């Protein structure tokens, strides 16, 4: 790694920075619509994904040493729909990104002598693959009615107050904090 | 349920509100010390628990219809230590609460004709039991060196950027966002 200035990798980094910046915003707006649709756990994962996009953008932006730079590129023009649709559009763009755009960008960085940047573009691809995965399972539970209803009794946690509930479905109201079903999630352990 | 004024349940609600308010603060301070100790996932669970305490306090506070009211009660006087110790003090107080204090308070509410409040005190007890559980497993992994090291290869997620890593231990540095190991957690699915 030399200088980036004038290289193709230089425009590739700005282009990625540009689509990741917009993605932060759309995930943030999709999070607010999810909360409105009554899926608090899905709202918080949009917001988490938003924040992780900010951090992919920041590692990238830091490679730039430049001034003003012109790019040609395509981006979704809209749109905010119902949550299911939001989760499908998101997944589709995460898809294009880990299967198409970052493999290429990594290739050329590599090919221009920037292998570290190449690493970074490959590592981000990994993250976008989990993001898509997440978005697809949530969209499938929405499509199959299993957000707030499972087939054998399991335990549900209140995101708002931590209340735990043994049942096949979450309660219509939290007995502890009196927030509605929308606040409930599958209880999970990850330690 | 009548009026609460003058009842014993009346002082019980304020006393619980008082210990839960302080608990919010101590969990918030324990979260900052955890971040300093290099346990980001544990930092965020302190902060989450803090927020759930706020919401137990709020359901309670809303039952009050009163003016100024005198209480006698004991509270921890201090202290902020290392994270392990923080997790053990927290668990001990969560313990006293679900095994002793809220069972009683629920009893008397019940016994004074306030069964709904009684429910609420029982439902909060449930939440505090999961909180303790959480705190104990994290303190055990800290004691056994398994926060950031497992015995068979498993996958670790970067909290900062979503990067996923297959291995027995988390990386020393995230390849995607270049944040240190402290940001990694066991990857979990709960949908
Ligand atoms: Fe992504
Ligand atoms: Fe609740
Ligand atoms: Fe608690
Ligand atoms: Fe990372
Ligand atoms: Zn990204
Ligand atoms: Zn509480």
Curated annotation (Swiss-Prot), chains A, B:
The keyword Metal-binding applies. Its main location: cytoplasm. It comes from the Bacteria. Fe(3+) 1 binds at residues 20, 53, 97, 128. Binds 3 Fe(3+) ions per subunit. The keyword Iron applies. Pfam families: Rubrerythrin, RUBY_RBDX. InterPro entries: Ferritin-like (IPR012347), Ferritin-like_diiron (IPR009040), Ferritin-like_SF (IPR009078), Rr_diiron-bd_dom (IPR003251), Rubredoxin-like_dom (IPR024934), Rubrerythrin (IPR052364), RUBY_RBDX (IPR048574). It is found in: Cytoplasm. Fe(3+) 3 binds at residues 158, 161, 174, 177. Fe(3+) 2 binds at residues 53, 94, 128, 131. Its cofactor is Fe(3+). Homodimer. Possesses two rubredoxin-like centers and two non-sulfur oxo-bridged di-iron centers per dimer. May provide oxidative stress protection via catalytic reduction of intracellular hydrogen peroxide. This is Rubrerythrin.
């Amino acid at each position: 790694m030399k200088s980036l200035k004038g290289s193709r990798t230089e425009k590739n980094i700005l282009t990625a920075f540009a689509g990741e910046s917009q993605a932060r915003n759309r995930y943030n707006y999709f999070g607010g619509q999810a909360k409105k649709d009554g899926f608090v756990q899905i709202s918080d994962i949009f917001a988490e994904t938003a924040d992780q996009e900010r951090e992919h953008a920041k590692r990238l932006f830091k490679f730039l040493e430049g001034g003003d730079l012109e790019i040609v590129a395509a981006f979704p023009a809209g749109i905010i729909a119902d949550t299911h649709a939001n989760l499908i559009a998101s997944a589709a763009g995460e898809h294009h990104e880990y299967t198409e755009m970052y493999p290429s960008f990594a290739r050329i960085a590599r090919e221009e002598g920037y292998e570290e940047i190449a690493r970074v573009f490959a590592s981000i691809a990994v993250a976008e693959e989990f993001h898509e995965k997440r978005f697809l399972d949530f969209a499938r539970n929405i499509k199959e009615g299993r957000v707030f209803l499972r087939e054998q009794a399991t335990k549900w946690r209140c995101r708002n107050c931590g209340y735990v509930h043994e049942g096949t479905g979450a309660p219509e109201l939290c007995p502890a904090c009196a927030h509605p079903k929308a606040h409930f999630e599958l209880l999970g352990i990850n330690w």
